[PDB]
């Protein structure tokens, strides 16, 4: 049960050992590329609860994103921008999920989990082979990931009345004049 | 007569059967379907494996009918089973 100890550590990320590790890793990542491949996740507890498995077909990619304003504000999140740049880089993979890994004064650093839909280790596993279907091509561009669902407001309740079934679908329905035959 | 006021006593007829349901002028199709439901079936009795019979026969050949000693034995009962499990397997194999 080592991963329960890691979950409590990520909670305390201002603390002495986690501030030290985030400092020495953010320094290392600045000399690296903007988008580069990570052999293993920096937070293996977070990746695994987001869906990462140590199988042939799962890869981890680390990306830095510029932080600040676009006072115009970009409605696209920094996490969604992190997903979209990696999916452009790996046009053959599928973006599964992403998580925060580090940040700086200029950049924000994210690790993204990708799944190879053509690897037949992936194709044979019923827990993941839904992603081999072509309705899951480029989920990060359609807002189908966890960042996208948050920014689209796909939550139950009276607070999310305009957006829970699709915001534009709601507007088209309410702005349609419906005429029947026997009026 | 209802001493405890039970709203379910009048509709009566904690383990139940889990796979089937113990149940109680008309159209010809309905009468034909009733003959399909009530038709007698095949038992299809499972059998003990050959090594399972050898394991059980070795236990009778040592301890006879003492189920307590067979469960308490370790050489001939490696996967330690209770006497209640061994007694059921003996009664299925015909070795009492």
């Amino acid at each position: 049960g080592a991963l329960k100890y890691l979950e409590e550590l990520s909670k305390k990320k201002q603390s002495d050992v986690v501030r030290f590790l985030l400092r020495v890793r953010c320094w290392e990542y600045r000399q690296l590329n903007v988008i580069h491949r990570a052999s293993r996740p920096s937070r293996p507890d977070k990746a695994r609860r987001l869906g990462y498995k140590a199988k042939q077909g799962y890869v981890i990619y680390r990306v830095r994103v510029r932080r600040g304003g676009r006072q115009l504000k970009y409605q696209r999140s920094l996490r969604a921008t992190a997903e979209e740049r990696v999916g452009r880089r790996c046009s053959n993979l599928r973006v599964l999920n992403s998580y925060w890994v580090n940040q700086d004064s200029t950049y924000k650093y994210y690790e993204v989990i990708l799944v190879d839909p053509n690897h037949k280790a992936i194709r044979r596993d019923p827990r993941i082979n839904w992603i081999c279907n072509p309705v899951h091509k480029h989920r990060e561009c359609r807002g189908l990931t966890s960042t996208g669902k948050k920014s689209r407001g796909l939550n139950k309740g009276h607070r999310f009345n305009k957006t829970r079934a699709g915001r534009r679908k709601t507007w088209k329905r309410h702005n349609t004049l419906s005429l029947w035959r026997y009026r | 007569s209802e001493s405890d006021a039970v709203p379910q006593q009048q509709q009566q007829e904690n383990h139940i059967r889990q796979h089937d349901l113990e149940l109680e002028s008309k159209p010809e199709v309905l009468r034909a379907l009733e003959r399909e439901a009530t038709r007698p079936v095949e038992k299809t009795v499972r059998h003990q494996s050959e090594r399972e019979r050898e394991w059980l026969q070795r236990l009778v050949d040592k301890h006879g009918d003492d189920v307590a000693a067979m469960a308490r034995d370790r050489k001939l009962n490696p996967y330690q089973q209770t006497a209640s499990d061994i007694k059921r397997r003996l009664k299925k194999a015909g070795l009492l």
Binding site: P126, R127 | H19, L30, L33
Partner: peptide, 21 residues
Amino acid sequence: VLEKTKKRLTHFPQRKYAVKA
């Protein structure tokens, strides 16, 4: 299909029934 799913289909499959009038 998964082993858990096959186990549930083996022992609790869809039955064939009717309801009388």
